[PDB]
Write a protein that binds this ligand. Sequence first.
Ligand SMILES: [Ca+2]
Ligand SMILES: [Ca+2]
Ligand SMILES: [Ca+2]
Ligand SMILES: [Ca+2]
Lengths: 413, 82, 85, 48, 48, 48
Amino acid sequence: APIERPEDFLKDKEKAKEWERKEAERIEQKLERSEKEALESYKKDSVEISKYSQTRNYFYDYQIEANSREKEYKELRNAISKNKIDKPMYVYYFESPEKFAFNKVIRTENQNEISLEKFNEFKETIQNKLFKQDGFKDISLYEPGKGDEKPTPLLMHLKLPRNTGMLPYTNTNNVSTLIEQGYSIKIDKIVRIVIDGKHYIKAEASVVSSLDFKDDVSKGDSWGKANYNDWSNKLTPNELADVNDYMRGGYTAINNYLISNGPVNNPNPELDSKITNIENALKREPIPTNLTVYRRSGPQEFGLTLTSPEYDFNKLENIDAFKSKWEGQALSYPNFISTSIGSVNMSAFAKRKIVLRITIPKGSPGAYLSAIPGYAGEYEVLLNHGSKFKINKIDSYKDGTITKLIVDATLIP
Amino acid sequence: EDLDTDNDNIPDSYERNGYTIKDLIAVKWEDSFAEQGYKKYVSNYLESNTAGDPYTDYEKASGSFDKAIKTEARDPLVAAYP
Amino acid sequence: WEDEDLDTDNDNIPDSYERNGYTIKDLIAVKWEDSFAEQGYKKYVSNYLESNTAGDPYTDYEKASGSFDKAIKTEARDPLVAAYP
Amino acid sequence: SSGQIVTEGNSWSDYISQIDSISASIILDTENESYERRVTAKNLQDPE
Amino acid sequence: SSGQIVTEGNSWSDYISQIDSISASIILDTENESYERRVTAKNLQDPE
Amino acid sequence: SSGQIVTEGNSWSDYISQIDSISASIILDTENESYERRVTAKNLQDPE
Ligand SMILES: [Ca+2]
Ligand SMILES: [Ca+2]
Ligand SMILES: [Ca+2]
Ligand SMILES: [Ca+2]
């Protein structure tokens, strides 16, 4: 009768259903007075709320506060954070291959065989990449069998790390659990299996944690100031002066000089000395943890103009062309990059239709420029020039009547 | 084509015109398979259980059941019945 | 196809390993080699289209790894011999 | 999938009437052993 | 995976016929103890 | 899972055979009380 939870339930269902149900009745007692109404509202909607959870942090801060679904999302987030598992857990769920920037179809709904060519193409697409996952999702604690719904040929086998949210809820008929995703995943191995005469792809997945404040900016300063208060006095007077003169108006000139192939054929020795000194001072205190930062960009950074027909992302052909052109291709900048760790919308880049989501690996060089009180800029972290980025996934969201793109990337060393 | 109606994991045309199981996947029947010891199966494309016994068409043909059931009860038209 | 990334029966052992030969070390199946014999490792072969080759309630991986009741005789650890009282 | 057999609650009496309704019975006697079978037969009065 | 042995609900009666169908019986008698084993055998009439 | 203790469904007969098959029995007599223990013993025929 007493069912002990292992790391993985493998294919046991009864041992999983009973454990999940018991946890459900245990959690039901501890819930607050409006948590039940939030759960019921999710139960009746179950679709729009997930999309809102994914795309809410990209609106204006006053828009975010004025959003009608903000309270329910916050309450469900609190409920998920209420229950943290003491030990890791292996989970199962079905994910469409299109999530991993694979536009081709592995197989249709009623097809059985998976060809070798599709498997090889998917393996080539997925390897050596990082994919970010967000939103509320239903998760299965056991590998599905003949009594379960299997909508997509791709089955994901993921291992939830320490201190992850968990919430077994009863949808008035059965038992199910709900989680919130704020983490990045990597596919290690894919193998072809057979379930009831249809082939399937089983992917082993792992979780790579990242620091992402989303719309919470007070916590952002709370960490940035603590990180880079000691960075101020470490800078030598010459390097400190060069750093100051950067955003005292010289950053624009330096960036224009650096974009136009200056330091190669038409250089300026003073500019080269300044950039060398500031990049040396930047390397003093690199970021010691994986970090997620945001940056609003325009068509000029991606080889387009504000009048380009492809820039109008309200027509699906434009999105298809942009994804086929940019997904799976490297992006390089020859100048310095300043990004905002907060995802809130601001009047500075209101009209821009492209949003960048830069992922900073642990130990990568950087500097929190927002540590000086003399600069009115908010939430800025700087990077060295000559950078390289890899485009992983491209998504589109509606901001009123304007369709804007979210781009995820990765800065290799 | 690859249209499936009764959700038995066997396409309608395969059930209507003949099929066989190899590597646990239904494949279109070819006349040269008889030399290697294979069999030709036809079943109801509108019923998951053609013969009425508990096991579906795919299970009976693939052999994915009790391995003590006589081998003649593997084609969908003969019911496994004690 | 032409790679060792297939599991038709879905029992944690690849098809070619069950077809040719394998052994379990550190709870992971590896390709059999003749040098493993001197260290005391056995060579296992089993059905690659069946999860339980011998028909007993334990899969091929459980028997080969010895991750079942430890009161079962050691000769019943290979997939071709059934655990049966 | 994991090759585990359950024989509890799977009564043979839920299928006896259904099988007998839509089948034809054939018996072979031989000399030392008897065999009995049912084979599904089509109904020409049901177009479906 | 956590060392949890349960014997309730597991029955050998479900597997006896299946094991007897697809195996041969080998018996060793010695002089002080007897042994009985079942070894899986291949069916040449089944290509799969 | 809530800090309580449950003694239903936890039977020693499941672990008796497994403990006995891989352990060596040591008994101490003395005069007042007798002690009986089992200690795990390594198998030298299995490299794993
Ligand atoms: Ca069908
Ligand atoms: Ca059918
Ligand atoms: Ca296998
Ligand atoms: Ca096997």
